[PDB]
Amino acid sequence: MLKRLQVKNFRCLEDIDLPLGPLTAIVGPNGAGKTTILRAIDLVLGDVWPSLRSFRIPQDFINFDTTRAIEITVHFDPPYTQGSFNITAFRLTCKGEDADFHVDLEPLDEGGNVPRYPSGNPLRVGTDMRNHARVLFLDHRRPSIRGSILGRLLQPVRREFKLQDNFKQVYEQAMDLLRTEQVKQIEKTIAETAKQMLGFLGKDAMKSMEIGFGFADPANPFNSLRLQYREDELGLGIQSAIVVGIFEAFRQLGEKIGTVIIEEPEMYLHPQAQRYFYRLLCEMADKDQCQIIYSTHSPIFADVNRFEALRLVRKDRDDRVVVSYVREEDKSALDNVRNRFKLGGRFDTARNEVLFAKRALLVEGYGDRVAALQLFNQLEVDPDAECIAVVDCGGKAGIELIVGVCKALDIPFVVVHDEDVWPIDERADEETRRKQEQENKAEQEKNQRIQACAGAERVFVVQPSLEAALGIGRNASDKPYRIAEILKTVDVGQPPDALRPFVEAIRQVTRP
Amino acid sequence: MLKRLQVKNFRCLEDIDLPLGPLTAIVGPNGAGKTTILRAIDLVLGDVWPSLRSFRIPQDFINFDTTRAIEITVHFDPPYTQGSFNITAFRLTCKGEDADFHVDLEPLDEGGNVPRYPSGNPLRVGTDMRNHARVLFLDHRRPSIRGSILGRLLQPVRREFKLQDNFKQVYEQAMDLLRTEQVKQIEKTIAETAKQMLGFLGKDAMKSMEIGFGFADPANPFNSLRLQYREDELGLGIQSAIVVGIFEAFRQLGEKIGTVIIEEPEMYLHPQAQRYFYRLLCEMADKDQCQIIYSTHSPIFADVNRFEALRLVRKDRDDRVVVSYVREEDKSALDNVRNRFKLGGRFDTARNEVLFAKRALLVEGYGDRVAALQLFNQLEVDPDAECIAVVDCGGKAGIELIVGVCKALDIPFVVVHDEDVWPIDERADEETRRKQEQENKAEQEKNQRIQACAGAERVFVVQPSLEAALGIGRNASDKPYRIAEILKTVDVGQPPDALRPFVEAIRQVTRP
Ligand SMILES: [Pt+2]
Ligand SMILES: [Pt+2]
Ligand SMILES: [Pt+2]
Ligand SMILES: [Pt+2]
Ligand SMILES: [Sm+3]
Ligand SMILES: [Sm+3]
């Protein structure tokens, strides 16, 4: 599998370095580098040998510069053994001094050096070596489909095939029904003309070449097989559905298929089908049957609970592309937080919207979101137009989790939550007093952990709780019409003292 | 045929407006707008219906702006009649206020307005209307080929086809040799999964859909036919040769095929094959059998004698794309100059290099070029590295022609030529004296015409001639070794007075 990508001076990617894992989910705004990361991988490892014909000069250089060298380095594991060399990466360079540019594909060892022979010449990247690490690229290709993707599916079929001779005779029999006299004269005009054009190259005989009409190589028929259907946004959805079916056949066939890159796996799938596809891709990645690298705009394919997969790509104040992800050092602390949330917590795909927003307001629960959005409306802010995600995190442990992801990804955020500490009723019985004390301490610990990960300047605490600030019963705590009519009597100008941290949280997350 | 293209705010094309003719040859440096012109036409008239899915937002807006509206207008002739409307152009707009963008395809009448019905609603662009003007786009697609290009070739074949029933039974017979038990289980997994993904859309039955393997629609087999060969730069050349063969079949079939756009018709063809292809494209355009619009880097496809075809595209001091061409007003004067050159003049493809250069030095003849290039070498300038074309124009009338094209195209240039006026030998006989006088006046007229079109500040005159300045005989006037050894004794520092206009011409064309 691919392990790491380095890109220098390629289109919008001035300098970038990101890890790659069994599932790599790449998110970020349009034009901010997302697709260019994928194209850089395809340049080195796609099915066209990297050469000067692979680049647009100067289109592919930063600023159309060309005094800078394009450099794409792809690292992988396990190493490729060539004789006495173990190669762990390829480095594709395109540079030049005007006006002769050139590209090199160099092999690199564990230590980042190009091995050389005792003769002193460097080791060059050969066919077997590059095909070692080749990737399937599913870009938006989506009444028929075909590609190296289906080809890889049929390669166990193409193997045990044993009726090649019979197929040739039936195939030719069918081609003869097509070869009208006019068809043959059209074919002869094409083939004779092409051969004359080729003759100018001087390479002869060359007269061994057959050029004609047909719809398959009868020797290797499974190389022209496609999926087809009878009968366009409808057509596009059908072709997306057939792709899901192809991947479902892979999973049942169990064969390892290596590295697949997908531009927007969601496209033209119903959300329910996107859920089915994502679950399928995750099973194959986790089972170690392939590696999936993709760009996505869908919160169904960008799961906050799988935070190791996340790469967030965007341009900084200076139009410099920057990639964010959970650092290795930090994975274990966030994983602990993910586990604490899984005890009693429930997962919610809607929370993944945090990954697509300019800014996030993190709240505990459904009632808090309803109240937040009504206050937005009273402050005359539309959170959808401002790309502010208001995220129901599923309680305090859930907030910790989303905070840790936002912190690791450099997503700006504000937290609001209740204090949930209550004075002890000195008249209650021993068990109630003791349990109140213990609950207060537990809540204080949860409040302190949120403060430690978010920072205090990003956290607003409603004392003792939003329910108490609103005067709202326990029954009605989540009824939107009840929350709305209470909040409609409040004055955003001077929100009550109890309610003040809630509306100030919304003012902070709104502040440009 | 397409008549005109207007592009506003699309990628690098801030504002541009160019005529389109039966042959349109688009030249200019890489990234300077050449290919973007072609892509803009394809957006409106390619085989994908223009919609919001056609654009990259913000990638396709100038500066990734999106506060500006993309506008592509394609004009054509003859008009399309829809009921009582005559449409002569389509206008594709993509704009929006964040964050909902949208695209409109509007029909336009003779006067540039969108017709509306008595109801007041505008006329919309329908299928038949847009297909009226659809273009074949041959982009770099180049062991098999296929596209709407071959499809258009076979459409007279697909017509008179009458063995559909027999073909179905032989075709299925061949598919049965492939359908192993494992193949059928793979196919059932694909089809059942795709149908389940489609079922989430709610559209039912939908159970009428057949999804399976195959290599043709047995009902319409000529829609899956391809050209193939046995067996990659060699492969790329073969596929280019097959394209030439397809166009040669078109010319023999005589059917009109409308508008074809080609990205770099030269690519992977031998120069001799490029000459064959260009001649073929010109016959079809002149015979009115199609319209060819292409970008090119080849002087074989960009003929200075066909100056009406030329469009030169480049970025000005400010990175603003500017297109140049011979204006309508000016065509008749340049055509007169082209005719005067055709009496006794000989054509030379090498002269087309003027169209690809940063600057051109225009000289009369072969001996003048040799001398120019040797002086470049003595001035320690490499004209190839500086993109200076030294152009042998074929005599003074030939210089007029190239000057007129360079002037119309805004190519910077310098002219050097001989005066060729000689004192009359008062001892000669009457006929020689009279002929000398008449030749002097003829030469003076030719010298004056060059001065009128080039401007005097761009013209250097060697008095009486370079041969006389060099002291070189008539025999040796064109022998490079003789010219070189004479020039090697000259001092670029203070070239003789007779030679001075020649070396000063070279210093001017070299001056940044
Ligand atoms: Pt980009
Ligand atoms: Pt891109
Ligand atoms: Pt461009
Ligand atoms: Pt481009
Ligand atoms: Sm609460
Ligand atoms: Sm001369």
Author numbering:
A (entry chain A), B (entry chain A): 1 to 142, 149 to 237, 245 to 525
Give the authors' words:
Overcoming lysogenization defect (OLD) proteins comprise a poorly characterized family of nucleases that contain an N-terminal ATPase domain and C-terminal Topisomerase/Primase (Toprim) catalytic domain. Class 1 OLD homologs exist as single, isolated genes while Class 2 old genes always appear in tandem with a UvrD/PcrA/Rep-like helicase. Here, we present the crystal structure of a full-length Class 1 OLD nuclease from Thermus scotoductus (Ts) at 2.20 Å resolution.
Optimized crystals of native TsFL routinely diffracted beyond 2.5 Å and structure was solved by SAD phasing using a platinum soaked derivative. The dimerization domain inserts between the β8 and β9 strands of the ATPase domain and consists of four helices (α1D, α2D, α3D and α4D) that form a kinked structure. α1D, α2D and α4D from each subunit directly associate in trans at the dimer interface while α3D bends back and rests on top of α4A and α5A. The amphipathic α2T helix packs against a hydrophobic groove on the edge of ATPase domain formed by α6A, α7A, α8A and β11A to bury 920Å2. The sulfate binds in the position normally occupied by the β-phosphate of ATP and forms stabilizing hydrogen bonds with the main chain atoms of G31, G33 and K34 and the side chain hydroxyl of T35.
